[PDB]
From a paper:
The WGR domain of [name] has been shown to be key to DNA damage recognition.
We determined a [name] crystal structure consisting of the WGR domain and catalytic fragment (PARP2WGR-RD-ART; residues 90-583) in complex with an activating double-stranded oligonucleotide mimicking a damaged DNA. The asymmetric unit contains one PARP2WGR-RD-ART molecule with one dsDNA (DNA-1), while the biological unit has an apparent 2:2 stoichiometry in solution. The complex is formed by two dsDNA oligonucleotides joined together at the phosphorylated ends by two flanking proteins. The WGR domain detects the phosphorylated DNA end coordinated by Trp151, Lys130, Lys183 and Tyr201. Tyr201 (Phe638 in PARP1) forms a hydrogen bond with the phosphate, whereas Arg153 and Asn127 (Gly565 in PARP1) interact with the N-1 nucleotide from the 3′ end and bridge the connection to Gly314 of the RD domain. Interestingly, in addition to binding to the phosphorylated DNA break by the WGR domains, the crystal symmetry showed that the catalytic site was also in contact with the DNA, namely the unphosphorylated end, where the last A-T base pair is opened up. Upon DNA binding, helix α5, covering the active site in the inactive conformation, is divided into two parts at Gly338, and the helices are completely reorganized. Subsequently, the catalytic transferase domain moves ~11 Å away from the DNA and it is rotated and translated implying mobility in solution.
Residue numbers in the entry:
A (entry chain A), B (entry chain A): 91 to 209, 231 to 338, 355 to 583
Amino acid sequence: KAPVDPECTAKVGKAHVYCEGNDVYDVMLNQTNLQFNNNKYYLIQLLEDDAQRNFSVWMRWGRVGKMGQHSLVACSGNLNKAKEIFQKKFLDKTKNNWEDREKFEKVPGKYDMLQMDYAESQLDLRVQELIKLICNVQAMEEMMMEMKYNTKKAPLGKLTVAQIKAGYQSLKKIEDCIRAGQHGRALMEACNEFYTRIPHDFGLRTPPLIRTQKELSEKIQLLEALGEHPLDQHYRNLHCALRPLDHESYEFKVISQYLQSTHAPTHSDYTMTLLDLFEVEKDGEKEAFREDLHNRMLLWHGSRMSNWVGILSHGLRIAPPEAPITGYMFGKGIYFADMSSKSANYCFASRLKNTGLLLLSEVALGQCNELLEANPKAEGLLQGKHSTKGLGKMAPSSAHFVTLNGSTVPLGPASDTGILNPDGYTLNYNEYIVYNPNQVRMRYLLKVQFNFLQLW
Amino acid sequence: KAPVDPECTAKVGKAHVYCEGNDVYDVMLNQTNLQFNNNKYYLIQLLEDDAQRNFSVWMRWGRVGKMGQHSLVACSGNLNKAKEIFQKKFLDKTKNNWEDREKFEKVPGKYDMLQMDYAESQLDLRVQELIKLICNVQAMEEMMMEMKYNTKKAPLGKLTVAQIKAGYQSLKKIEDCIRAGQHGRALMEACNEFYTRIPHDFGLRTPPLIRTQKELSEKIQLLEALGEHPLDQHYRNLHCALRPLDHESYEFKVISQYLQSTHAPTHSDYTMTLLDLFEVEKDGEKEAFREDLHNRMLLWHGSRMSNWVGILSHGLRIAPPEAPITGYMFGKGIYFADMSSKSANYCFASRLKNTGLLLLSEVALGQCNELLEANPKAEGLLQGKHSTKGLGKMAPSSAHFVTLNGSTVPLGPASDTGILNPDGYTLNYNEYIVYNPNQVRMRYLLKVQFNFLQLW
DNA sequence: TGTGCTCCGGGTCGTC
DNA sequence: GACGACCCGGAGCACA
DNA sequence: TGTGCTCCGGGTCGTC
DNA sequence: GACGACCCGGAGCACA
């Protein structure tokens, strides 16, 4: 059932992989160490000629994807010898005995072992063109196909379900220290294990450090390429409810007016056209809200089209303790604006793909700690207060405000606030921030079309 | 006729070295570079199975003496391919095409090619115990035997007469730059060629630089170990005549008296016993002598037992132009003493082998340039004179002199000369020197037994 | 007479 | 040692 | 309780 | 990668 390595031109078809009980003498090793530009494989087999009892040990090895060098060792009838040679080479390169291979343990600077495999829409059309954008469906398809027709996928052979399961472990090992964000040399420790357990053909090019979140996807599709309408069960996992809204309903009228009237004058390189409007209701958020706090406002939050999945799936999160505190003017937290164009800027859309989303959201502010200058330790300066508000040269005025289901909507136009920071950078526009997702109820999700002034 | 490499376990006996016309597909390469500790060999063969027309190219290689690694390449019936592989590898490592191998040329950093071989005394008993000492017969025998029973002699196989002929070329290449004396990195250039053309098993120990004259002999015996009583035809090559002399003949009486009376008082750690006395008559020396010069003296010259062959064979030579002028107080030349123990010191004999020789010799001095201090440029200071005499604190006095066949014998005892060098080293004893072998007639050859005062 | 340009092929180096 | 990559100069050539 | 001592066996390195 | 050498520490042991 385990084939004689087709590269052994001397015993192909004319012999078979000797086997004894539940113990098969055939193995594929593999080791990849980005540090040393190592990406090696080592194959061993124990052969019995079909016709006679002639024995021999076959050894192939080289870089993954190349066929490398070989060694054919003739043992004649001394099988006892062949099993020494086989197990000797196996101990040499694995540092694991052949008899306790069931309990294998990869040694750094030695080879891992590898188990080889020898063998209707239930949603409104508006929500469907939404999930299609949130999950990049046209991409995950044209790329899922590109895997199905990639030969270099399995350069050592079809892997086993178990083997790939280990692929997800070491892939998630990377996922976790990147969802932590630490590239502090633990990215090497973990990536080497994924390339090791999951062979890759890089030719001789040094293998990459898998950092971006996109690269993480390609692998998922890869691993899947080795193993309830789709759109409808994507929606389910979000555990969030998104409902179209009528373009004349009271909410659309007011959320439009808010989006337009609060588009800042200094963000004059584009306008916005509210293509569609969606309600937002996430599990456990109503239960968890701190509705006792006053100064509740419906406020904007924008982000790259690329990231709206995670926001709806696990909610609006805060930076991890790894503390990449560079642009977080007021410390790790959940930022909101009372100008639409302020948050639309963080959608980072392009002329070609010119439709980002915006998250209106009820924010229990409480009493605001109002600050001209920025202080990344601001969460500590509350001294009992419940939010922080960076002050801007411009803001909507209370004269023009309105209320929608108990939250204050700060309709434009914006107006000069006379706020100036003598010591340093003065903010253009307010920036509200809370440090606890319990002060956040995701209430509306705009889908916006961007219109650029420049032509190129 | 060329055997299938016994190390090819898969085709031994069951196949033969394919051959076409006068062109045989079998080769032994070899390269040794002391600089890089390289001592490698490379074997290629082209095989045809006896039974079928199946073809294959066999390649063995590694360090000389080890069996190394191998590559067996199966070509099936595509002989046209096999000859490519064979000739490809051959071009790869020789940088010489296989078709013009007859005109082979070793490239530095590439492999040389190797042609493998696939297949009563006529003298007085006193002169015989003399040649026995001059040629180290007991040694050249017990060592000639040690070669006959040295297996590591030919680690790559029996060489051909032609191959060994090249061994003598590269051996003499060393002989000449050591008979020149230059170790100025040309010893490497030449030695590498001898080890290359003549394989050696050093294990992994870095091969030696062959410097001493003894090492040169071992090789001669080696090369001979790969390819008219002996004593009587040794004598012949010297082209010098050595005749016993009676222990009561007038010469023995006077040469004794000279040897004893002129043994210096400060050389008091030994005495001498004239075992035998031999006349000396060398071809062309009488004809060439400058007998017109006055102040002819019979003077001593001693030297290591090891070197008496060369002195009698080519005469008394002078240092080559390479000018190792370190102990040559008065410039390159032929030195003599008028004290026996002065020259007996340069025999460098040991308690165990305690019999050196001494060369009495007629020396046409002419007018002497007499010098307290030494001047290695003294040959230039003659200004017409024909010899130089370093002055000693002690010398035989003319009162006690005698003449023997027209040369002045300066019989002892020696006496203080009151000679003192204010500026530097004062010589203990006279040191006569001439710069032309035509002022030298080798007349007598003493054989002396040394007797040590110390016991250990 | 040279200047581009590609294509081959060796030399060195890097990985196994 | 076995390959494969990589760098790089020279052969041959089109073109002006 | 440790101190010699040899013998084995891995780790590293060097040559092909 | 394949070997072989070489270095070196630890296991086992005799001995006091």
